[PDB]
Amino acid sequence: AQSVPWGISRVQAPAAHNRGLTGSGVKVAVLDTGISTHPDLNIRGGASFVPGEPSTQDGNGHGTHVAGTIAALNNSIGVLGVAPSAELYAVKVLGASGSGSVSSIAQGLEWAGNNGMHVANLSLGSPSPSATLEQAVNSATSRGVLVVAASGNSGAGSISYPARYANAMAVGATDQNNNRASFSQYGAGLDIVAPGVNVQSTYPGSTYASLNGTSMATPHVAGAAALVKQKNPSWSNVQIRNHLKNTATSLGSTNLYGSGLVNAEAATR
Ligand SMILES: [Ca+2]
Ligand code: NA
């Protein structure tokens, strides 16, 4: 039996699927700890930029979980992604510890741009500015990638990097009451929010796990971007980003929420 995680329903992804919008033909790079093969995922390709970690398999779990929020297959098992037909690419930029380097993240962004990705999901952050990260985000954006990044889990009123940079779409986390999760970073640069508390998704070992974080919110938005791109194949990164914001459900102050809760149904009307 397939379960629909609450956040997938909350972003109204099933309604989009009922329109026939699934993310088919849309290339989504997951810049993370890898993606492990799983009965509820299809992985089309990828690359590793972690020294000494040559494979794209996930030695952590984080990247596999993020990937399932984007694209868990629509079937009789497991969970269900926002964009269950998206073409997933495992871009390993974080090691098994859950951390990476600017170098590695930047290389993954460069790979996404050079491989024609439509969306790059960055469920990751660094506390300090990094001109190398800024330039890699700008380069990927120039090449046509929509970069979507987590705001961070410190609870502070400023957001992590690279989310803080203008060309990364910054995603914070909400809870089941549609309030900002306590940990969700906010402030200048926040674009949008999505479910990030008690998010069930795929995990290595052909299993499932529930996690909290802005890392879990981010892939809901990446998946919604894929639905919009399937409907509107001519649209740029910027057009997609703006449409997601314009069709979000306002939750209050933009300082706390950006444009509010992403809404895949509204975004694909
Ligand atoms: Ca499934
Ligand atoms: Na940003």
UniProtKB/Swiss-Prot annotation:
Intracellular or extracellular location(s): Secreted
Record-annotated Peptidase S8 domain positions: 5-268
Binding sites annotated in the UniProt record for Ca(2+) 2: A163, Y165, A168
Cofactor(s) the protein requires to work: Ca(2+)
Note on cofactor: Binds 2 calcium ions per subunit.
EC number(s) from the headed UniProt entry: 3.4.21.62
UniProt cross-references to InterPro entries, sorted A to Z: Peptidase_S8/S53_dom, Peptidase_S8/S53_dom_sf, Peptidase_S8_Asp-AS, Peptidase_S8_His-AS, Peptidase_S8_Ser-AS, Peptidase_S8_subtilisin-like, Peptidase_S8_subtilisin-rel, Subtilisin_Carlsberg-like
Enzyme class: hydrolase
Catalytic activity: Hydrolysis of proteins with broad specificity for peptide bonds, and a preference for a large uncharged residue in P1. Hydrolyzes peptide amides
One GO location term (cellular component): extracellular region
Uses described in the biotechnology field: Used as a detergent protease. Sold under the name Savinase by Novozymes.
Record's keyword terms, sorted: Calcium, Hydrolase, Metal-binding, Protease, Secreted, Serine protease, Sporulation
Binding site for Ca(2+) 1: Q2, D40, L73, N75, I77, V79
Note, other: Secretion of subtilisin is associated with onset of sporulation, and many mutations which block sporulation at early stages affect expression levels of subtilisin. However, subtilisin is not necessary for normal sporulation.
Recorded family membership: Belongs to the peptidase S8 family.
Function: Subtilisin is an extracellular alkaline serine protease, it catalyzes the hydrolysis of proteins and peptide amides.
Name of the protein described by the UniProt record: Subtilisin Savinase
Lineage: Bacteria, Bacillati, Bacillota, Bacilli, Bacillales
